[PDB]
UniProtKB/Swiss-Prot annotation, chain A:
Name used for this protein in its record: Spike protein S1
Record organism: Severe acute respiratory syndrome coronavirus 2
Positions bearing carbohydrate: N37
Subunit structure: Binds to host ACE2. RBD also interacts with the N-linked glycan on 'Asn-90' of ACE2. Cleavage of S generates a polybasic C-terminal sequence on S1 that binds to host Neuropilin-1 (NRP1) and Neuropilin-2 (NRP2) receptors. Interacts with host integrin alpha-5/beta-1 (ITGA5:ITGB1) and with ACE2 in complex with integrin alpha-5/beta-1 (ITGA5:ITGB1). May interact via cytoplasmic c-terminus with M protein. May interact (via N-terminus) with host bilirubin and biliverdin, thereby preventing antibody binding to the SARS-CoV-2 spike NTD via an allosteric mechanism.
Known role: Attaches the virion to the cell membrane by interacting with host receptor, initiating the infection. The major receptor is host ACE2. When S2/S2' has been cleaved, binding to the receptor triggers direct fusion at the cell membrane. When S2/S2' has not been cleaved, binding to the receptor results in internalization of the virus by endocytosis using host TFRC and GRM2 and leading to fusion of the virion membrane with the host endosomal membrane. Alternatively, may use NRP1/NRP2 and integrin as entry receptors.
Effect of V16G: In strain: Omicron/BA.2, Omicron/BA.2.12.1, Omicron/BA.2.75, Omicron/BA.4, Omicron/BA.5, Omicron/BQ.1.1
Portion of the full sequence shown: 198 to 246 of 1273
Amino acid sequence: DGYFKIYSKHTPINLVRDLPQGFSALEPLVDLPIGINITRFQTLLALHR
Amino acid sequence: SKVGGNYNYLYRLFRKSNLKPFERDISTEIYQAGSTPCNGVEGFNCYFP
């Protein structure tokens, strides 16, 4: 219905390459009514020269 | 309603489907009503919505 719902939570970790076993929830943060039809997305990163 | 008429109001006549509540449609193109592609040029069975 146009509304863009976003949740989040922050937590550190001490690991090399894995996903640790445990439990943690998420909470609502912010909602904006952009209201555009959406069917795709991508992602941007950074590089060190 | 001025003398000579006001023509700053436009609306879409032809569409390929129905809309959803609280959703907009602003992009414009040509509409084909027959079995021949319009080829981007106004012709028979080719009308601006």
